[PDB]
């Protein structure tokens, strides 16, 4: 699936092949993160370790369900981290399909 | 002086139609929009009279056919009682 790729019955000719980009960020002192809408999920974002990452890809999901990280209609790639001591934000300015993993330690 | 129709107070006559609601039943402001439970009487000369909510006095909408509910709103209402 690295180049030409099919999903169900639809074919992506992917003429440029794999071009994805990724990067991680560590937030010492932070236990609570928020943002990256739109998801039918809690205000405080959940860890994605045992499941799916949060998906940012504007999609029309018929009769969408609650408490899951499926991508809904809008995507704002902005994450806020809050603690007693400080507030931080990350703004990932990318317009392509984006997945976001969150892990606590 | 003037006393409310429900006896909740008694006020000088300069507090009748003074654009502030002083009676619980709204009876001190029959000509303004100041009371939430008041009524404005459309005389509609020559035709059927009508009562409207005080909140529709000078709201810019023609509620009476004679247009007398809009006298200081910037909306000029024509007489349509015909």
């Amino acid at each position: 699936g690295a180049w030409e790729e099919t999903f169900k019955t639809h074919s992506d000719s992917k003429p440029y092949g794999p071009t994805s980009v990724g990067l991680d960020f560590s937030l010492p002192g932070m236990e609570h993160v928020y943002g990256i809408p739109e998801h039918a999920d809690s205000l405080r974002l959940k860890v994605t370790e045992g499941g799916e990452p949060y998906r940012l890809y504007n999609l029309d999901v018929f009769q969408y369900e609650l408490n899951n990280p499926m991508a809904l209609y809008g995507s704002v790639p902005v994450l806020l981290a809050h603690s007693f001591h400080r507030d931080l934000g990350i703004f990932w300015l990318n317009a392509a399909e984006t997945w976001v993993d969150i892990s606590s330690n | 002086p003037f006393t409310c129709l429900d006896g909740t107070a008694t006020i000088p006559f300069d507090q009748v139609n003074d654009d502030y609601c002083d009676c619980k039943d709204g009876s001190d402001e029959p000509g303004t929009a100041a009371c939430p439970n008041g009524s404005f009487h459309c005389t509609n000369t020559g035709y059927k009279p009508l009562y409207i909510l005080s909140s529709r006095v000078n709201d810019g909408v023609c509620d009476c056919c004679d247009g007398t509910d809009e006298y200081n709103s910037g909306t000029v209402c024509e007489n349509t009682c015909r």
Partner: protein, 152 residues
């Protein structure tokens, strides 16, 4: 509840590739010999240790206590997309200064402080501090992945 209509991460081939990369020693490293402090930015070459792919890190301190990190290919076969019309202005920059250096590290000061950026050379890493408090790290878990444009 039939969600087979929509891809999981595993069914997305770029998500499956990226997520298979797990926390560890990053193969990227900054070439401090290529370091250049420009008017608006610091630029330095990065390299993938195995594939020898060359990237360009463009680091910027910004007014209002912000940092912007941009990474692109040094010699791309074709231009990569940069999101237009979302930013309302070209963000006003603040001057970076080298305020510390060793063989594997370059410390950068944003204007006159208190914000600093530590660029580690090998492995590539970014740390952001206010004075001596570590605020945030970049690529600390070694998950940076940049698939360069191959022959179409």
């Amino acid at each position: 509840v039939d969600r087979s209509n929509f891809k999981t991460c595993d069914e997305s081939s770029f998500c499956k590739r990226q997520r298979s990369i797990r926390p560890g020693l990053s193969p990227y490293r900054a070439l401090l010999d290529t370091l250049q402090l420009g008017p608006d930015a610091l630029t330095v070459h990065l390299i993938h240790e195995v594939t020898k792919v060359l990237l360009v890190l463009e680091l910027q301190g910004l007014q209002k206590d912000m940092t912007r990190i941009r990474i692109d290919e040094l010699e791309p076969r074709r231009p990569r997309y940069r999101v237009p019309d979302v930013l309302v202005a070209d963000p006003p920059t603040a001057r970076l200064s080298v305020s510390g250096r060793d063989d594997n590290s370059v410390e950068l000061t944003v204007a006159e402080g208190p914000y600093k950026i530590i660029l580690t050379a090998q492995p590539f890493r970014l740390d952001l501090l206010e004075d001596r408090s570590l605020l945030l790290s970049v690529n600390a878990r070694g998950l940076m992945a940049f698939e360069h444009q191959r022959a179409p």
